[PDB]
Amino acid sequence: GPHSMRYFETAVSRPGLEEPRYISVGYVDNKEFVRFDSDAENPRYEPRAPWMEQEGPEYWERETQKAKGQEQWFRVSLRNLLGYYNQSAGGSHTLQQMSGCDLGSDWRLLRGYLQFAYEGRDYIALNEDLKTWTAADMAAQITRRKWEQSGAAEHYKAYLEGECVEWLHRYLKNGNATLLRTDSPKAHVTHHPRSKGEVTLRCWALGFYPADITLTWQLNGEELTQDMELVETRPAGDGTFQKWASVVVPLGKEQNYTCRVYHEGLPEPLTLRWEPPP
């Protein structure tokens, strides 16, 4: 289906002397594939996916050198922003960046991405045209005007439509066996008697990959909207995900309710109900 590549970068300024921490995390199809952390004893980009071992020592040295430069760029940028917002001198602040590309099933570029956050809030974003900028506030407009003047979008557009797409094509080929793999959810219904002659019916979906899933509860083939409790999709910690959806039903009427699980990894949507033990 569709593909993506992202680099999630964070620079955190620390109290007084200790110098900012710089972290860069690379993703291919929402899965971590590389990581750099300035706090490491020997800071370098390291493989985080087994298919990344295919890259020679030169890839890692080049990537590490880019991170060393990025760390310095974020130091200067954090200082400039401190002066725009007048928090000025030596406090604890965050600067974040997201960049990358989205590809179609035909591997053609759908969209380029470039965004910044200061203190976890939107600061400046490159528009979908990859030519113009949207600043979030007055201080970010100083950055926008600086970047409009120096034609910064042009070099970002070149990476996003070029190297970003080119390297993602390479990674998709090298990690083909891994990236194409789906893990089907294993579903079951739990039964939790409560007050007023009612029972909670909980439909669990476990062991699935990717995280994208839909769990629906129906009363005699009719969808149940706001009356349904859901947990946010959560990692199992083994590469798979979990999710559950529950409904409060009257005791004795459990067989009128059905749960359906929709996942790209499934041969067809699952249909299940409370299976009482004998």
Binding site: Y7, S24, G26, V34, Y45, Y59, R62, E63, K66, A67, G69, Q70, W73, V76, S77, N80, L81, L95, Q97, S99, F116, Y123, I124, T143, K146, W147, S150, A152, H155, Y156, Y159, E163, C164, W167
Partner: peptide, 9 residues
């Protein structure tokens, strides 16, 4: 592969 920023903020 990662991108390098040039012009600072």
């Amino acid at each position: 592969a990662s991108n390098e920023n040039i012009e600072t903020m």
